[PDB]
Amino acid sequence: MNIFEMLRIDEGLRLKIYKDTEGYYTIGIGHLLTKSPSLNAAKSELDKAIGRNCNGVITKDEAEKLFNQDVDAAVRGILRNAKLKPVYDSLDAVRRCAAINQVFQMGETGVAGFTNSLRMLQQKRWDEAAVNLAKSRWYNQTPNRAKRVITTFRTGTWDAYK
Ligand SMILES: N#CCNc1ccccc1
C-alpha cells in the first residue's frame, strides 16, 4: 500500500465525467473539474486539463496523469501551509498518507481549520485525535471513507485498506 493505491481505492476510476459525492463534475481518480452546475463548463475544464477536445471522456493513462499531478499538488500545498506543514512533518510515512488523502478529498483550507485534531496529531495522542476527527461534517457525509482514513491516523498501519 502507498498513497496512490490508497486514493485509488477511496476515489475509484471513472473515464467519463461523473458527479462526486458533493454533486460536482469530476473525472478519473477524483479529479474535480468544477463546482459549476453547467456540464459545458466541466467539459471546458476537462479539455484544458488534458490539452485536447475530450468531449467528456479520457483514457486510463490520462486519468493517471491527472492523478499524479493532483497527489503531487496536494503534498506541495501541505508543505506550503504554515498550519499543516509542522503537523505533516511530525508524522510517520503511513500517517502522512492519511493526511494527503484528507487534503485530496477536502482541500487544504478546510483541513487547516481542524485545529484541535491537528494539535492532537502533532502530540501523537492518536486515540484522542481519532475521536476528534470523527466530530466533523467530513465523517458524517463520507463515513466509510473517513473511518478508513481515521483508522490510518489512529494506528499508523494500513489495516483499513486490506
Ligand atoms: N487534522 C487532520 C488530519 N489531516 C492532516 C492534513 C494535513 C496535515 C496534517 C494532518
Break the chain into its structural domains and give their ranges: 1-162
153 is in an annotated binding site: no
- Which method, experimentally, gave rise to this model? X-ray
Beta strands in the chain (DSSP E): 14-19, 25-28, 31-32
User: Is 130 close to ligand 1, i.e. is its CB under 6 Å away?
Assistant: no
Measured in degrees and rounded to the nearest 5, phi and psi for residue 101 equal -60, -50
Pocket test for ligand 1, best of 118, 128, 135 (most atoms within 8 A of CB): 118
At position 72, the amino acid (one-letter code) is: D
Query: How many CB atoms lie under 10 A from the CB of residue 105?
Result: 23
CATH level 2 (architecture), domain 1-162:
Orthogonal Bundle (1.10)
Instruction: Spell out the residues 6+ positions from residue 104 whose beta carbon is closer than 8 angstroms to its own.
Output: 7, 11, 30, 70, 71, 74
117 is in an annotated binding site: yes
Span from the CA of 111 to the centroid of ligand 1 (angstroms): 6
For cell 477524483, the residue is 30
Given a contact cutoff of 8 angstroms between Cβ atoms, the answer to whether 58 and 50 are in contact is yes
Residues in the chain, total: 162
CA nearest ligand 1 atom 2, residue: 118
Given a contact cutoff of 8 angstroms between Cβ atoms, the answer to whether 122 and 90 are in contact is yes
Q: What resolution (Å)?
A: 1.3
The radius of gyration of the chain's CA atoms, rounded to the nearest angstrom, is: 16
104 is in an annotated binding site: yes
